[PDB]
Amino acid sequence: GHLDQWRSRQKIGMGKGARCCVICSNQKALIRKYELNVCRQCFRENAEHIGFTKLR
Amino acid sequence: GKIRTKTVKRASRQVVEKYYSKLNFDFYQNKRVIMDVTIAESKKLKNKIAGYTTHIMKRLARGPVRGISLK
Amino acid sequence: GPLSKKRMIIRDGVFYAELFEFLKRELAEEGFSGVSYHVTTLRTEIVIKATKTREVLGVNGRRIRELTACIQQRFNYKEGKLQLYVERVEVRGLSAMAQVESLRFKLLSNLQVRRAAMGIIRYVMESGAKGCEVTVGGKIKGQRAKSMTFRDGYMIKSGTAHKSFVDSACRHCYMRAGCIGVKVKIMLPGDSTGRNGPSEPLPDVITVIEPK
Amino acid sequence: STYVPKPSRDNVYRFFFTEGVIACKKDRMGTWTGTLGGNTFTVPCIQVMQLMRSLKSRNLIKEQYAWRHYYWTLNDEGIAYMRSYLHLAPSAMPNTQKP
Amino acid sequence: GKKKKKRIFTKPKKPTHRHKLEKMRALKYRQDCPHPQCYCGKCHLT
Amino acid sequence: GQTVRLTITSRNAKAVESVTSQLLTRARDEKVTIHGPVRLPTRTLKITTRKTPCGNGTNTWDTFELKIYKRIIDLHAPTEQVKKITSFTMESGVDVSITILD
RNA sequence: GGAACUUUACCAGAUCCGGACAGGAUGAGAUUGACAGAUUGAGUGUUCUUUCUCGAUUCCCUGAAUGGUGGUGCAUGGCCGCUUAUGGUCGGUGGAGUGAUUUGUUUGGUUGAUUCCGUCAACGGACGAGAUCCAAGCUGCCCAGUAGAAUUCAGAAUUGCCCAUAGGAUAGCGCAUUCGGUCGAAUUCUUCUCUGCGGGAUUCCUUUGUAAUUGCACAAGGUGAAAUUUUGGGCAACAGCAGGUCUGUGAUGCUCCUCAAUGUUCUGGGCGACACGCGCACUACAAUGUCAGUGAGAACAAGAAAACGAACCUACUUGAUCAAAAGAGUGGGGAAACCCCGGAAUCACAUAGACCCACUUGGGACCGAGGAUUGCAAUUUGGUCGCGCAACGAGGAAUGUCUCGUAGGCGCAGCUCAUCAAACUGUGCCGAUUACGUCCCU
Ligand SMILES: [Mg+2]
Ligand SMILES: [Mg+2]
Ligand SMILES: [Mg+2]
Ligand SMILES: [Zn+2]
């Protein structure tokens, strides 16, 4: 009963709720390009380690 | 706005003092000498140094210049 | 299915960021100054650069085996495909990431901010750095927050040459009053070997070879 | 469901002794997977997080967190209790402890 | 903020469920669940 | 007769050039037919994000780029000779893939 | 920050504890979960009736704990914006002050430039400026079976006298042109293309130029692919700001809630409700137009999956014995390989095409009936037929941005993203007027 009711909508894979940042689990401003799945604010700090650099 | 920055001017003056008989009135031969006689991370600065060294040599032919002392 | 070339590098960068963050949080107590990895068919061979390599190793490799287990469980590495190595940094005072940690420990030890920052700068200057900058910001003198910066030597802050000639690191020190930010920037002197320093001449300087 | 069965609990305990450290992603859904002398056994991640929350509150383990993943390690007193809980032979040491 | 302004209830407070204690239920008992792995409480089979 | 392709991919231009030069030198030492080192187009991954963490002020943006350098080397050599050519110290950040072309 | 659910932080409900841990009261019945019937919005054990099942995992109450997109950005970290696009900034030691303070850092020229030159109670420094950096031009080596070319042997097609509707203009005068399916063979090569390092520009050269009357420079012309910070970016000192963010984070101090919860899940609704005011867009007001044909033509890019392929993007066929939108099938692409020979839209057309100055075949607001498709959910989104008689005929006071591949016009890609761009970040296409000044205004 309540086990089935618990998080039944969350079990569905669709939606902004399913996708979250891989560093902070925040579902807002997610960079899905190249399947990065990182929020923009976290990407700003982790860009150098990933390999991105500021040019032009 | 084509003024030679103090770095360029000092480097060119040192070049003229160190090598005077090895320089000329043209720019390209002077730059060719500059590449060997100077070590720098840039080529724009080398070109500017060569140009101002040519200017210094042209001035020196007419008369002595302030800041350069040839022994 | 095989992953695309533009996706494999993204995965590798994400993995490196994961490993760097995990190692930073784990070895914050020790003085650690970097991590590299060289994947091959046989083995991964992750290397860490630190200062307190004795405590990173532990007794009979206790902590290094614990870290290897951590990484293996995290990244599903097959048994025997992963190894961890630790190397002592050649110069302790030339690593901002170690110096900030040391300064954070000094701050958390209830030491005065001016004295701790001055000691950090003195050690960095003794280590041979061309210049050092230390910034401490937060509620130091009471409810109102202030920022104090202590400088010595040369420090370039413009262009892209500073991203190579200067190494920087920032940490958050948590105190009963609140959070205090500590930042340490070091100007690495040029060394022809390339182990420390950029190994190239400064963009500004022009040197004329002495005639024979 | 944080209600964890005893067989899954002691299987997780046996894994945590065998391997000195254990990692689990912070996810209420999904299953944590482990290996005990071969094969593969799964247990939901939430029960593992609850169990090792209990261990951390009892000062049994040391916990670290980074990028939506936990890392739980066993100290000397932690390994001691684990031997006592599993009634394991004395002188038995985790794979990390074994030279 | 989210002030705890409290709430008026139009219904009574539902009680917490308690397991019924059957003392020595084994002595009292009876059909074994036909279901292989297993009304059958384990399989909820009616 | 039988041809094998080495694909060297990296983020570091210096590293990929050094690895390609090392492979070319090893192939020349081994005296095998080499169809040149081909420099495939460099691929740029670009991501633009808001600089601010809150949405306040002038809408300033930040552009991050990542460059991909790929080289291919075609040679006529069997598996053992190719393995002997490829087996050396390598460099970190670059990867070499072996393929057999039909 | 393009919200169907989720997100979501708000509202009406209903679940769970995800209160660890310690101390009590229990207790091998502590407990867990339940079929049915009714409870209910719920074929929700949610709670009950009811018995089963699970088994020391858990209950009970006491402190505690925990979580919070609770608070406070006037407690903070970090980051960002702004001051502040300009040329600024600060030691030391010496000089001057009773001192705060000052000099250096001055004025003259020069410059985008605290840029240089000259001067000098300063003399030496440090930082910004410039330099460095990353793209655009032009070029050297390399390089091709993920890029091209030109030959040669075939295979083929047109082939001469040919005069539109009324049929103008616009090169050709050993060897006639063609034919990415003719899927032709062979041989050679790197004109284009690819790309890691190179080069190239420096006021370099020339004025009976200006200036100089040392200089620092400057204006024309030259040379050149490029002639002045070559061009567009990035980076950017030192002070600030109670600027924004406690809704990015396992950044946090202090507080608040904490088991009919300010935690968490689930259900229904809201975030999109209108008389209005304002910011910013998009489409219009037609003929330098609108329909309907044909033609020729870019660039930036993106593509599939955990604990053998399948998801992703595609071409081609078919549906088709008959609208679109579909829907199938078959291949290919992990992306210089497939898409792709990337048939973009501006644009062209001597198309002998329609309209003919009207709110009209201008303009689509808004609404009706059908059908498709995304989706768990459409009370989303295409497509078809109606509606157009919705304004609007170029916009008062006002007021934005912009100097060359620029403005403007035109598309295209990425992004968010199951579905949905009048948005943004890029990208090519077509391509002007004016100025080359000034301190009137700010
Ligand atoms: Mg406010
Ligand atoms: Mg305020
Ligand atoms: Mg938007
Ligand atoms: Zn994040």
mmCIF file of C-alpha atoms in Angstrom, chain E:
data_model
loop_
_atom_site.group_PDB
_atom_site.id
_atom_site.type_symbol
_atom_site.label_atom_id
_atom_site.label_comp_id
_atom_site.label_asym_id
_atom_site.label_seq_id
_atom_site.Cartn_x
_atom_site.Cartn_y
_atom_site.Cartn_z
ATOM 1 C CA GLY E 1 8.439 32.354 6.497
ATOM 2 C CA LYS E 2 6.330 29.151 6.688
ATOM 3 C CA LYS E 3 4.548 30.225 9.932
ATOM 4 C CA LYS E 4 3.123 27.250 11.919
ATOM 5 C CA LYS E 5 -0.357 28.910 11.986
ATOM 6 C CA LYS E 6 -1.698 25.403 12.939
ATOM 7 C CA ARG E 7 -4.729 23.747 11.230
ATOM 8 C CA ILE E 8 -8.380 23.120 12.292
ATOM 9 C CA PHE E 9 -9.370 19.469 11.591
ATOM 10 C CA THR E 10 -12.805 18.408 10.267
ATOM 11 C CA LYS E 11 -11.982 14.737 10.997
ATOM 12 C CA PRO E 12 -10.815 12.840 14.146
ATOM 13 C CA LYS E 13 -7.108 11.912 14.517
ATOM 14 C CA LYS E 14 -6.719 8.440 12.893
ATOM 15 C CA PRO E 15 -5.026 6.067 15.414
ATOM 16 C CA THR E 16 -1.618 4.418 14.882
ATOM 17 C CA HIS E 17 -2.077 0.758 13.836
ATOM 18 C CA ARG E 18 -0.880 -1.877 16.367
ATOM 19 C CA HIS E 19 -0.100 -5.540 15.465
ATOM 20 C CA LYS E 20 -2.643 -7.920 17.090
ATOM 21 C CA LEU E 21 -0.843 -10.208 19.614
ATOM 22 C CA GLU E 22 -1.960 -13.878 19.289
ATOM 23 C CA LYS E 23 -0.444 -15.499 22.442
ATOM 24 C CA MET E 24 0.754 -19.075 21.639
ATOM 25 C CA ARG E 25 -1.027 -18.861 18.228
ATOM 26 C CA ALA E 26 1.028 -21.971 17.267
ATOM 27 C CA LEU E 27 -0.805 -23.940 20.015
ATOM 28 C CA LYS E 28 -4.206 -22.749 18.640
ATOM 29 C CA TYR E 29 -3.273 -24.047 15.128
ATOM 30 C CA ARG E 30 -4.230 -24.205 9.358
ATOM 31 C CA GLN E 31 -3.977 -24.903 5.573
ATOM 32 C CA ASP E 32 -0.328 -24.622 4.360
ATOM 33 C CA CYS E 33 0.082 -22.029 1.551
ATOM 34 C CA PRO E 34 -0.182 -23.910 -1.793
ATOM 35 C CA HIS E 35 1.950 -21.180 -3.450
ATOM 36 C CA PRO E 36 5.465 -22.661 -3.896
ATOM 37 C CA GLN E 37 7.506 -19.822 -2.318
ATOM 38 C CA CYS E 38 4.658 -19.145 0.187
ATOM 39 C CA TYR E 39 -5.330 -16.053 3.288
ATOM 40 C CA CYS E 40 -1.585 -16.802 2.876
ATOM 41 C CA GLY E 41 0.017 -13.801 4.661
ATOM 42 C CA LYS E 42 3.320 -14.213 2.751
ATOM 43 C CA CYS E 43 1.691 -14.174 -0.743
ATOM 44 C CA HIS E 44 -1.594 -12.397 0.233
ATOM 45 C CA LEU E 45 -3.124 -15.405 -1.620
ATOM 46 C CA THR E 46 -6.918 -15.661 -1.050
#
